[PDB]
């Protein structure tokens, strides 16, 4: 048995040495000459005075106008962000929701939480009402994050140290991803949806191939639970957000962190991470009731979206990059522009 | 406005549904059930009548409880305990069927959690009779070597009560210890009395008068 422990140590050290060789520079150096982004003094353009309880997730439709919001009130509400009109209010089978996803087509919504199942809702059933198209039971723990690849395929991350790919049409676990040693609290699929990364409370984020199931890369920058994860819009980098008060910009091809974001005035943990469409801004959310717009290249806090009265649970830039919406335990969704 | 004028009416209508639903849901006295494995959580849930969480809704003396049992979560509590803020009280089973230190660790974590500094821990010392039986042959010192006293039911039960009370490091909050033999129907009445006292206290907090 002990031979495998030696092999693990030596292989991890091989990865570490290979990255030490690949560490010829750092983004903080090469980007020095690039201009500051200035004072990004965004304003709250709308406040979605809907939910009556903690908002735990919100997600953007590909049309960049409809955002779905999920709350402990047991409701998934569809928001017309340009008008703050509610278009669907879906009473869940379980009040204990902790994630929410909008299918890219706009056809389905996914939901889940402590019920340990992911609920797939059909927004455009011919009967008109939003009926549950399928319930994806099979996790042995709370479903922590959900993300559609399309109307049928959906990936999930759950408290029981695993991520799983399903057929929302039939309900099977088409493929299941294992290798976390802790709760997989976060999930983000690449912009082309060919692979995804998930951040787990084992203080690491892991890269999964949806077709092969292989865990071909692993990232280990943090020393805390990685509450949030998000691909850089080019799909070759992703931001990891942790309770350790540091967002960290990893690179797929570099195989470890390019730059680590931190400032010591902040001690709260990160609850969300969200790039702006250019990849130049990182609107990370904090438990301190404020989201801080980091200059993603020069690693400088360049503005703050202060205004929530309680921790921000989620943040998301519109797929077109027009706006960034953040949701908070204050029960309000704010649209920032 | 041409027909978004009607989408506006839809939005207002389902906002009204949200309002009514929120009012209806606020009335329910949320209660979180905690305690070590097999420590009798299921037994009280059963006596009070009516996979990752099993809400046991039941109504007593005009007051609707929602007793949430979370025992199915073999996962880190800190990642979802914050969902259970504003549970009007924690209902805490202790199994004196045997020994328990795990139960003290669980209680200490729960009552000192930053999320529950305002949340009272109702604390049912259940299976009292079996405790009395084992005391007659197996002393309480097998659980607490520091226990310096006469090994008897009347003393050991109060010692256990005092131990659990002592984990409340914030004087802001109450602990309501009540013994139970797991064979009585007064249990729900006990929960009701503790919950009404907690409701009084938590209303007075909001009024700023307390």
């Amino acid at each position: 048995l002990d031979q495998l422990r030696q092999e693990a140590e030596q292989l991890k050290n091989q990865i570490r040495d290979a990255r030490k060789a690949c560490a010829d520079a750092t983004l903080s150096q090469i980007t020095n000459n690039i201009d500051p982004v200035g004072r990004i003094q965004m304003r709250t353009r709308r406040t979605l005075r809907g939910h009556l309880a903690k908002i735990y997730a919100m997600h953007w439709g590909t049309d960049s106008r409809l955002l779905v919001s999920a709350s402990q009130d047991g409701k998934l509400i569809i928001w017309d962000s340009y008008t703050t009109n509610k278009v669907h209010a879906i009473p869940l089978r379980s009040s204990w929701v902790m994630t929410c996803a909008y299918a890219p087509s706009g056809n389905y919504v996914a939901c889940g939480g402590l019920d340990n199942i992911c609920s797939i809702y059909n927004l455009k059933t011919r009967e008109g009402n939003v009926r549950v198209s399928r319930e994806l039971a099979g996790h042995t723990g709370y479903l922590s994050c959900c993300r559609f690849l399309d109307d049928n395929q959906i990936v999930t991350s759950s408290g029981d140290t695993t991520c799983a790919l399903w057929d929302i049409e039939t309900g099977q676990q088409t493929t299941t991803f294992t290798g976390h040693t802790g709760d997989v609290m976060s999930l983000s699929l690449a912009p082309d949806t060919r692979l995804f990364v998930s951040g787990a409370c084992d203080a690491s984020a892991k890269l999964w191939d949806v077709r092969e199931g292989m865990c071909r890369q692993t990232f280990t920058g943090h020393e805390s639970d990685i509450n949030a994860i998000c691909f850089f819009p080019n799909g070759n980098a992703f931001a990891t957000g942790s309770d350790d008060a540091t967002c960290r910009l990893f690179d797929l091809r570099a195989d470890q962190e390019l730059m680590t974001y931190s400032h010591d005035n902040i001690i709260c943990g990160i609850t969300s991470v969200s790039f702006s469409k250019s990849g130049r801004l990182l609107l990370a959310g904090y438990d301190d009731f404020n989201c801080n717009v980091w200059d993603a290249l020069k690693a400088d806090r360049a503005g703050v979206l202060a205004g929530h009265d309680n921790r921000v649970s989620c943040l998301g830039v519109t797929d077109d990059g027009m706006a960034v919406a953040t949701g908070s335990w204050d029960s309000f969704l704010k649209i920032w522009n | 406005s041409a027909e978004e004028r009607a989408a506006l009416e839809r939005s207002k209508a389902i906002e009204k549904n949200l309002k009514e639903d929120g009012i209806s849901a606020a009335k329910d006295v949320k209660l979180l059930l905690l305690g070590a494995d097999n420590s009798g959580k299921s037994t009280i849930v059963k006596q009070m009548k009516i996979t990752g969480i099993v809400e046991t809704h039941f109504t007593f003396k005009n007051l609707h409880f929602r007793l949430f049992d979370v025992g199915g979560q073999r996962s880190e509590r800190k990642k979802w305990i914050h969902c259970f803020e504003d549970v009007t009280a924690i209902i805490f089973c202790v199994d004196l069927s045997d020994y328990m230190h795990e139960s003290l660790m669980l209680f200490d974590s729960i009552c000192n959690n930053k999320f529950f500094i305002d949340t009272s821990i109702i604390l049912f010392l259940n299976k009292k009779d079996l405790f009395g039986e084992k005391i007659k042959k197996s002393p309480l010192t097998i659980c607490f070597p520091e226990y310096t006293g006469p090994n008897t039911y009347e003393d050991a039960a109060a010692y256990i009560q005092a131990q659990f009370e002592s984990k409340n490091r914030s004087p802001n909050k109450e602990i309501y210890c009540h013994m139970t033999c797991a064979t009585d129907t007064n249990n729900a009445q006990v929960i009701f009395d503790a919950v009404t006292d907690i409701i009084i206290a938590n209303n007075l907090r909001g009024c700023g008068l307390y």
Partner: single-chain antibody
Amino acid sequence: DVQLVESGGGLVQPGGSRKLSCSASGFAFSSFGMHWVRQAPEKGLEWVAYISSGSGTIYYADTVKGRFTISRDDPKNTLFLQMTSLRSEDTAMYYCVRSIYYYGSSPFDFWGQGTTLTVSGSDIVMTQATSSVPVTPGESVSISCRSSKSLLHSNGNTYLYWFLQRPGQSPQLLIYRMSNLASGVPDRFSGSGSGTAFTLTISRLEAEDVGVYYCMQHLEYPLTFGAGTKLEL
């Protein structure tokens, strides 16, 4: 199985009164808005009344209002249209049509079978020059539709709707908001045009597409219908 069944229409005397009804099933009637669409025996459609979901807002045309009243019996899923003082112009058939409004919705998406009946000016108006059109299988045809005021609203929507009343059948929604294919419509339909002039193309026509096409504005009530296109094989 979405279902919507009108009833209550029949022969009645000049100056008489009647009550029509439409019984829904298979869909959440409570959440949909309901429409009634008149059709004289040898003429195009006319919008009669609209009953909103929750019955808060109710609309009527000038030729109907002051003599008609409507209501929804929500728990039985049956909408009621009450009509009084019927004149010969009321000899029409009356269709029952559901709608619901939200970003991306498709109003008028389902039509009833139509209840027949017999009796023994500043608003938007629309026209179609293609009153008749000889067409053939495999050909392609373009119904032409215009308006007196632009249907393109400031919010970027253009509220033009295209319906097909196949011979004997009920009107089927083909294109809503002048570009969008309603559910179940084949890929071969398309909507086009902007402002006050509109056109819908039928690519690779088939005998199953024969019938009379209607063009309706939704910009503001009353929803005036076009005279329609008698596409005949």
